[PDB]
């Protein structure tokens, strides 16, 4: 009787990274302005499709400010980072995801012989954007049944 092992998680790039492209600050003029969204796939590999499909996932991250808790704060720069802009993570349907321990079902597909879940990331304006490095971090959390 052999025990099931958990999945090896990936996120497109091997550095678990996602290119958000430039930040057109003139196009992020006021609160609620948003960049065009870049898609990325999380992959659950080397595990029984039952374990992956059954798992429940969520996104964790520090909000840009108390006013926008579903938007990520930018990673702060030494030269200083862009302001009044954050990163927002959407599901396959363009809907924005929360950033707390608010977990949800993975909805994995055996697309590409492996259990993959699509996502999107974009910039969300919080006021007038101001130029600056606009990196961002987030923990993906996979909880197993």
């Amino acid at each position: 009787e052999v025990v099931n092992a958990a999945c090896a998680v990936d996120a497109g790039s091997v550095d678990q990274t996602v290119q958000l492209g430039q930040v057109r600050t003139a196009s992020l003029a006021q609160e609620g302005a948003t960049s065009s969204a870049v898609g990325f796939n999380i992959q659950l590999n080397d595990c029984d499709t039952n374990v992956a499909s059954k798992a429940a996932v969520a996104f964790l991250g520090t909000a840009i400010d108390a006013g926008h808790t579903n938007v990520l704060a930018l990673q702060s720069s030494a030269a200083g980072s862009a302001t009044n802009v954050g990163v927002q993570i959407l599901d396959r349907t363009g809907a924005a995801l929360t950033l707390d321990g608010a977990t949800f079902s993975s909805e994995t597909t055996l697309n590409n012989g492996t259990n993959t879940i699509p996502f999107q990331a974009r910039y969300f304006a919080t006021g007038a954007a101001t130029p600056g490095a606009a990196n961002a971090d987030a923990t993906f959390k996979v909880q197993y049944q």
Partner: protein, 191 residues
């Protein structure tokens, strides 16, 4: 990406330690692996010690985490007790403008007393049900944490406890994930 060697960990009481494999399938990358235990309430109460709490993985490798019982024997000895193993993999690398991602694998850590009466082989077969107009109540009379799935929402029914899930039908089927993170055969619900 990095994965754990199991979906769950059964810690038999009396055992000094238990092992849990961690594997980085990528040879071209480096992670920092930070892992810790929480209790049923997600509080890192240090009942169980994980070593190393923090360590580096560079390339195709397999390291082993060690989980140590330090509960002082004060956990209930009549029933399982639920904890959570949390292993956090953090990438480490530059071109600008990107979302950096760390992954957390959270699995169940079951503290299992010794000299238990009911063998673990035949625990699920005891699940009982109690329907209520718009809510089904699952009853688990076993000292084991039952994990009900493919119940036609899922349910984790605690030992000696119950668990309720919310135009439903009549006849009901289910199965469970055993100690081996594997699926037991399907079973019919019983009132």
């Amino acid at each position: 990406g990095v994965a754990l060697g199991a979906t769950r960990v059964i810690y038999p009481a009396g055992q000094k330690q238990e092992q849990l494999a961690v594997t980085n399938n990528d040879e071209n990358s480096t992670y920092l692996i930070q892992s810790w235990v929480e209790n049923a309430d997600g509080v890192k109460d240090g009942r169980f010690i994980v070593t190393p709490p923090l360590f580096a993985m560079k390339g195709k490798k397999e390291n082993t985490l060690r989980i140590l019982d330090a509960t002082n024997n004060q956990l209930p000895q009549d029933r399982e007790s639920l904890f959570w193993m949390n292993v956090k993999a953090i990438p480490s690398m530059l071109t600008e403008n990107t979302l950096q991602l760390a992954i957390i694998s959270r699995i169940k850590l079951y503290y299992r007393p010794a000299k238990l009466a009911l063998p673990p082989d035949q625990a699920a077969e005891k699940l009982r049900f109690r329907r209520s107009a718009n809510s089904l109540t699952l009853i688990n009379p076993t000292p084991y944490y039952l994990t009900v799935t493919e119940l036609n929402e899922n349910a984790l029914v605690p030992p000696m406890g119950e668990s309720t899930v919310k135009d439903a039908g009549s006849n009901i089927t289910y199965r469970t994930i055993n100690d081996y993170g594997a699926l037991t055969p399907k079973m019919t619900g019983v009132m």
